[PDB]
């Protein structure tokens, strides 16, 4: 029962800066829950995020690892993935892109 992390190719969201938001990734596992992290792309490198709240949720027999934005801000714009190391193999999801739209500020 291999660990799998699913994000559909070309996954994307547009959200207004100042609003609450979360990104989710479904984690498939059968033994102990793997240690999953979120990372954010900087060029070709997916940089581990450690300063942003993460949580786990169970929904319809599926586990989700969640990244929280409280609220989303313009700097949160970019591409994100979930990642885990399972038996000496780096397993990362496809990128999801968060496009942050600036709020009315006239």
């Amino acid at each position, epitope marked *: 029962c291999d660990v799998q992390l699913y994000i559909k190719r070309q996954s994307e*969201h547009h959200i*207004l*800066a*100042g*609003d*609450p938001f979360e990104l989710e990734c479904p984690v498939k596992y059968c033994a102990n829950r793997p240690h999953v992290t979120w990372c954010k792309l900087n060029g070709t490198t997916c940089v581990k995020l450690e300063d942003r709240q993460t949580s786990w949720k169970e929904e319809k027999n599926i586990s989700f690892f969640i990244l929280h934005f409280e609220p989303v801000l313009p700097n949160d714009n970019g591409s994100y993935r979930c990642s885990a190391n399972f038996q000496s193999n780096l397993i990362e999801s496809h990128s999801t892109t968060l496009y942050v*739209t600036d*709020v009315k500020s006239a």
Partner: antibody
Framework: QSVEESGGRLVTPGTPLTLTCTASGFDISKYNIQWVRQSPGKGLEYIGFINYGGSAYYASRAKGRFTISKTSTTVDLKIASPTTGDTATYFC?????????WGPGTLVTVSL | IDMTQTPSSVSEPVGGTVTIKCQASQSISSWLSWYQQKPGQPPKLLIYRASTLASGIPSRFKGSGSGTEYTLTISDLECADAATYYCQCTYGGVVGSTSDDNPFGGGTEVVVKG
């Protein structure tokens, strides 16, 4: 987290009135916050919102009639000169494009 | 921007499907949310950004559309789905949009036939 409201009461036409929106479990001052009202038996009507930095914007019919403001702990809606038509339940909510947490509503009655 | 929500009321049997439409007067590029409101309760967010399901909302609720045309579909209708439903344009909050309004549609009363 949750959103609470207060201030709904009976006032005579033209008497200024302030409603207050507060939060439990989040900092209300750092999100976009919207105000929406509902006359008894009628639909929802958007009034305006205050952005996460503290600048407010209004539906054209609300501009000049309502002011939305915030402090570090509250978001306020002030009705400058209420008319009987302003009789309604007033709701505040966290977020605009993702407006996820709503207050229970506070009931304003404008009547002689 | 004006929002045209139809129908104003609909009745469907338990297990059936409800279809609600909202038309914007100009493209709002998927800046649209759907809410459920039961009597005496606040609006409850179902869908935001046209198709994104709010947390805790069952997948029986589906939002779709783009441009000027938006649809809320409620499948496998339950008695618990009896409520009034509203769209809201959220484009007024987007930087540079001309109107500052974020208008609601007129609502759709859903009667569930048991």
């Amino acid at each position: 987290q949750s959103v609470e409201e207060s201030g709904g009461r009976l006032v005579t036409p033209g008497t200024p009135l302030t409603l207050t929106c507060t939060a439990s479990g989040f900092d209300i001052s750092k999100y976009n916050i919207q105000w929406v009202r509902q006359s008894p038996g009628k639909g929802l009507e958007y009034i305006g919102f205050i952005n996460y930095g503290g600048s407010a914007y209004y539906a054209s019919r609300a501009k000049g009639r309502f002011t939305i403001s915030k402090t570090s702990t509250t978001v306020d809606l002030k009705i400058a000169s209420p008319t009987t038509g302003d009789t309604a339940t007033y709701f505040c909510a966290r977020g605009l494009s993702n407006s996820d947490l709503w207050g229970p509503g506070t009931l304003v009655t404008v009547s002689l | 921007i004006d929002m045209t929500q139809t129908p104003s009321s609909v009745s469907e049997p338990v297990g059936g499907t409800v279809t609600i439409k909202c038309q914007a007067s100009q493209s709002i590029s998927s800046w649209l949310s759907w809410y459920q409101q039961k009597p005496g309760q606040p609006p409850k967010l179902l869908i935001y950004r046209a198709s994104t399901l709010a947390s805790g909302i069952p997948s029986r609720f589906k939002g779709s559309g783009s441009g000027t045309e938006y649809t809320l579909t409620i499948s496998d209708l339950e008695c618990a789905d009896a409520a009034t439903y509203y769209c809201q344009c959220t484009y007024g909050g987007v930087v540079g949009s001309t109107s500052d309004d974020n208008p609601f549609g007129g609502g759709t009363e859903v009667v569930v036939k048991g």
